Amino acid sequence: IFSVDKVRADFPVLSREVNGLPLAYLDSAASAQKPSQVIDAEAEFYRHGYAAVHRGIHTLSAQATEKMENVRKRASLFINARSAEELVFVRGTTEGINLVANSWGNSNVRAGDNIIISQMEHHANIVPWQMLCARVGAELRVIPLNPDGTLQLETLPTLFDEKTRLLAITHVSNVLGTENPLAEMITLAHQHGAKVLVDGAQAVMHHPVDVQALDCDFYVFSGHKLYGPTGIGILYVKEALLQEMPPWEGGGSMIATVSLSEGTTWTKAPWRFEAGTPNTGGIIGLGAALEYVSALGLNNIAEYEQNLMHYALSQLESVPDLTLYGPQNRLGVIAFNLGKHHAYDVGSFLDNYGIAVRTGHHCAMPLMAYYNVPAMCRASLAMYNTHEEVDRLVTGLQRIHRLLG
Amino acid sequence: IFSVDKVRADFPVLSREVNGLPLAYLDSAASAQKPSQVIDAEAEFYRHGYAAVHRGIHTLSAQATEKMENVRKRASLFINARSAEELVFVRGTTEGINLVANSWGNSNVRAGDNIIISQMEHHANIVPWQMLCARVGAELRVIPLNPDGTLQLETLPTLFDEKTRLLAITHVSNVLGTENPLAEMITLAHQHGAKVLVDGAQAVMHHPVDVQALDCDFYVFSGHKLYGPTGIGILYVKEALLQEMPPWEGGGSMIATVSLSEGTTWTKAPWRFEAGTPNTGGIIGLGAALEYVSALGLNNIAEYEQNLMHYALSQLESVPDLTLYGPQNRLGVIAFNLGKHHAYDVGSFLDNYGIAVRTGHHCAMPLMAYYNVPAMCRASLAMYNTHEEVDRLVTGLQRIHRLLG
Numbered sequence A, B: 001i002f003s004v005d006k007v008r009a010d011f012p013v014l015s016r017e018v019n020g021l022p023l024a025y026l027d028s029a030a031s032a033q034k035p036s037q038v039i040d041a042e043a044e045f046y047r048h049g050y051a052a053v054h055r056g057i058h059t060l061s062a063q064a065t066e067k068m069e070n071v072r073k074r075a076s077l078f079i080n081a082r083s084a085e086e087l088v089f090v091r092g093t094t095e096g097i098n099l100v101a102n103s104w105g106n107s108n109v110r111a112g113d114n115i116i117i118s119q120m121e122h123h124a125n126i127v128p129w130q131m132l133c134a135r136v137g138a139e140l141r142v143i144p145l146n147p148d149g150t151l152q153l154e155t156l157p158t159l160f161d162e163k164t165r166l167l168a169i170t171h172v173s174n175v176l177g178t179e180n181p182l183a184e185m186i187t188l189a190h191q192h193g194a195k196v197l198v199d200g201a202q203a204v205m206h207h208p209v210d211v212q213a214l215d216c217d218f219y220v221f222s223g224h225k226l227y228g229p230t231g232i233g234i235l236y237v238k239e240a241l242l243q244e245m246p247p248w249e250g251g252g253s254m255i256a257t258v259s260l261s262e263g264t265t266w267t268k269a270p271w272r273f274e275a276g277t278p279n280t281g282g283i284i285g286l287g288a289a290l291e292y293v294s295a296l297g298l299n300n301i302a303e304y305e306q307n308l309m310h311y312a313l314s315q316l317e318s319v320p321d322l323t324l325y326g327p328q329n330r331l332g333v334i335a336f337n338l339g340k341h342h343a344y345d346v347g348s349f350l351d352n353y354g355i356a357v358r359t360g361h362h363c364a365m366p367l368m369a370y371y372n373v374p375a376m377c378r379a380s381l382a383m384y385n386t387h388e389e390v391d392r393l394v395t396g397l398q399r400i401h402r403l404l405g
């Protein structure tokens, strides 16, 4: 069972002060703080084992190469992929979606075809598809929202047809905390021969994820939201698909042969998709982040976070004129607005109290437009956040309401 | 003036042992070791100031955003760019070339046009242009090599014509150590209305670089070869060009507005070219690497390295049957083969002595083919390497020759 006090002891940032006040970091959905175990694993790699990794012969380079492929295997086990070779190292969720949109999209989505997204998607899972649709002359269809922040699943018959090549869908909304019924939707998409990319950037830190059970064709997430370093993420692709995909970025390490007269040939996947020096330091840190999370246990994390979320929603009932957005069973984040006050001002006052929340459109402008607001506040309730921090948020909103009403 | 002993004290890896023997790291051209100042600057950011950066309102996020834009300014001063807004953060040299090849290349290189590269280019500065040429139906022309590892500049009249859209050229060869006469070549390229991308990945650590004096249109380099963290590099583009370039990767932070009915608009450059969460940790580390190098002084580094290189070349004369590749005035690297022995075996014996060199084709297969060898050994002589390490290399090659002859 989970002890939030022992977990918080691993996170040096949580002792920091802001504005002279103790920090309450409620913005993990934008990016997560990192434990000492992750920070030090990367630092120690730099301090004692650093070298280039492309299977160099000397010892440090050979050992660094092995460390990197071991992290690839560990990540594949973390999401229950069948093979380490189904995982590609990318900069983050965003780059992984762009890689799919170009390598797979350009070869599989043709003029007159359509791609389906939802109205709750992050811009990372919208813009690459808008670009692809403009490149090839395809149509971008949209699953709309219900008022409670769930998908209008009844619209799926009008959106899926025989020209639907891809569903790109969020696992968990970064704003609403809605968890979408992926297994269901993937079954339906596969009935039409459509592939499914899942944006898992807000899923992998909250509960176990199993891509064989999901049967998704692509799955993406970012290391820095998973208590890991910036600059690294994971793209999972089914082996049979990944083996047919052409390269995206070109350069060293993704080639088999390079000739200026007879052209160039590519190596095998996933290495075909990793051009140039990888982010070895980020990969080491990501491996340590996975070990740290697995040691705590994702079901223990999920239990503690669900109880924290239930407590926050119960306490926020005592805030006057508070508008919440999204379903009651939300994961990870609480999106809200306070009376008629602009989110920017609410977030400013909260920051003035030492409380870090995110304000704005949260890279989800279509979602904001659906709710007819320009912005929202959002509080993340992660595994190192406490009841007392929730109390500080509730009290802060009460004070703000009273001061500005 | 330069003190190699004080510099080496900053680098914790240099005390490491390999095979039970003290490490001689002569592979900095593949990737450089990092000083404590760089390692700790990144670690301390994670420990005390970490947050997401897209101009979030709360304090940590606002301060992190400022740290990132300050590094952008520091990098622009480091290469004497006119404006911080001419620099784009990329994963490394390779990604930066791919970004140019797609964003600029797709809009400016048409069927029947030509692009000029050289026979000494790294694969990073070949493959993206091969891909572009195949995409748009253009021709990839090649400046050939002289036996001494310099460009056959006499061939330039037959290669430049009015259809030449781009010269992509290495500043310093990662194999030969040749420094190309960029200012000259850029003048000639501009006479034809061609743009010039410079691959500076092996230049920026050896002497000052000044892109206004060079007048190059694009310039790329990687942080990890500049004593900095992996996963981060710099693409410089002339403002007037960069402002016309369309985005490459799509997603959060590079947009102005996103609509599912009225389409999407882009923000201003360079931010238009940075999609999703940046590698904030790598950027912090890169800033510290720039400060560290500037504190030592690039002219002091260049002086010490030039004298070390002169010493090594003088000492290597006492190795029987040693073949050197490249010009006498080489920078940074010594490429060699020992008698008829395969580079792989020579490098294995050297690693067995604790000496890390690189063997293989060094991501320069066309260069290897020019010299009619499959592979070379390469020893890097960087600012923290010593005369004694050169002595160990010379003695090792002598022992290898005697044992295997």
Ligand SMILES: *Cc1c(COP(=O)(O)O)cnc(C)c1O
Pocket: A252, A275, A276, A277, A278, B029, B030, B091, B092, B093, B094, B095, B122, B124, B125, B170, B172, B173, B174, B199, B200, B201, B202, B222
């Ligand atoms: C290493 C190198 C590259 C590639 O840099 P990455 O950091 O691997 O992207 C490109 N060009 C030259 C000359 C190099 O030495």
Ligand SMILES: *Cc1c(COP(=O)(O)O)cnc(C)c1O
Pocket: A029, A030, A091, A092, A093, A094, A095, A122, A124, A125, A170, A172, A173, A174, A199, A200, A201, A202, A222, B252, B275, B276, B277, B278
């Ligand atoms: C943050 C996020 C992304 C983007 O991740 P990056 O790490 O910035 O690339 C994509 N999707 C969702 C749902 C997110 O929360």
Ligand SMILES: [Cl-]
Pocket: A251, A252, A253, A254, A255, B123, B362, B363, B364
């Ligand atoms: Cl290669």
Ligand SMILES: [Cl-]
Pocket: A123, A362, A363, A364, B251, B252, B253, B254, B255
């Ligand atoms: Cl955005």
